[PDB]
Structures are given as structure tokens and as C-alpha cells.
């Protein structure tokens, strides 16, 4: 799924704690609201623990 032409909102993404893994490779998640990107993609699949 391609996400574009919208104001990014990761505030609800890191303020929650239901997730188990929040590792961000390449870029650091501490500054995400100050970074503007051209294309945002999102994959989704299920895998065992």
C-alpha cells in the first residue's frame, strides 16, 4: 500500500504500547515529525513469533 499526499502522524504510533517491536533501521525515530519524505510505503503480513 502506498501512502502519499498527507500530513504524517506518527504520534499515535509510538505513544501506544500494544506493539512488541519498534525498531527503526537507517533513520532514528526520535526525529520523525521534522522529516519530510516523498513516498511512504507500508507492507503487511502475519508471521509466528
Amino acid at each position: 500500500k502506498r501512502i502519499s499526499n498527507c500530513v504524517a502522524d506518527y504520534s499515535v504510533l509510538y505513544n501506544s504500547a500494544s506493539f512488541s517491536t519498534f525498531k527503526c533501521y537507517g533513520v532514528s525515530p526520535t526525529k520523525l515529525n521534522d522529516l519530510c519524505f516523498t513516498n511512504v510505503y507500508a507492507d503487511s503480513f502475519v508471521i509466528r513469533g
Binding site: 502506498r2 502519499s4 499526499n5 513516498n39
Partner: protein
Amino acid sequence: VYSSANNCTFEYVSQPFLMDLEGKQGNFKNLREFVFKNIDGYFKIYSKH
């Protein structure tokens, strides 16, 4: 208007517009002008009824 499509990026809807689908042979009552431009890849629309 086309046969098929494969992949693309942009899609816009804006506010709904209502026109009349009935065609006649009488004299015209409105004039519409449109200007399409492309500077640095930016598409420009200029119109006024």
C-alpha cells in the same frame, strides 16, 4: 476512456460538481476559459466562469 491501468501515484477528488447532461441546439449562455501550465513540473490550473 481507456483500456486498462497498471500502477500510478496521484488521485484527487475535491468538491462535487453538478452539470446538466441534456444537450440542446440553442444559443450558448456561458463561457468557460482554462489555462494549463507546467513550470518545474508543477501543473497549474486557471479558470473562471
